[PDB]
Amino acid sequence: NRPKTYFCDYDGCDKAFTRPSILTEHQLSVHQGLRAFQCDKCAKSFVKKSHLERHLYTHSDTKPFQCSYCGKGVTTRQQLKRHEVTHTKSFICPEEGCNLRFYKHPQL
């Protein structure tokens, strides 16, 4: 919506941003080499609250997305969708007019 009208000034940086706090998040993270959210359970650190929140689940068994078929736990919707698509007849015969459909790619 609103136009990108805050330009990073550093040598060899191309980026422009919508609102000045975001330009500052970029500058402190990329160019100065500082981060604002530390893991309690390992050495790593993160640039956003949502990124530390994802990393915190990785230290735990009670992972926040749970499979509808097998009940395996995962941390975000992309992982869930890819995993659940393995519980489907995903693959299709690529050859002309052939009707068949398959569950594991080596079968196809």
Partner 1 sequence: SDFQIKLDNVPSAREFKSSFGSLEWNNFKSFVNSVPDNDSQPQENIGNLILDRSVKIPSTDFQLPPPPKLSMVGFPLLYKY
Partner 2 sequence: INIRDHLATIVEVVKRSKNGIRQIIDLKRELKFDKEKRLSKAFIAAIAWLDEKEYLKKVLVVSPKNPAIKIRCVKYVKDIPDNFNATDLLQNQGLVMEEKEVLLNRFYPLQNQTYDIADKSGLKGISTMDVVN
- Site residues (vs partner 2, CB under 8 A): 5-7, 9-11, 20, 23-24, 27-28, 31
Of 67, 73, 79, 91, the one binding Zn ion by CB under 5 A = 67
Which of partner 1, partner 2, Zn ion, none is residue 39 near (CB under 5 to 8 Å by kind)? Zn ion
| Calpha distance 79→61 (Å, rounded) | 16
- Contact track, Zn ion, 76-105, x by CB under 5 A: -----------------x-x--x-------
Contact residues for partner 1 (CB under 8 A)? 7, 11-12, 14
| Type of residue at 35 | R
7/69 with CB nearer partner 2: 7
Query: Which CB, 20 or 88, lies closer to partner 2?
Result: 20
Structure-token match 């080499």, residue found: 33
CA dihedral 73, 75, 81, 82 (to 10 degrees): -90
End-to-end Cα distance, the chain:
45
- Alpha-carbon span 21 to 23, nearest angstrom: 5
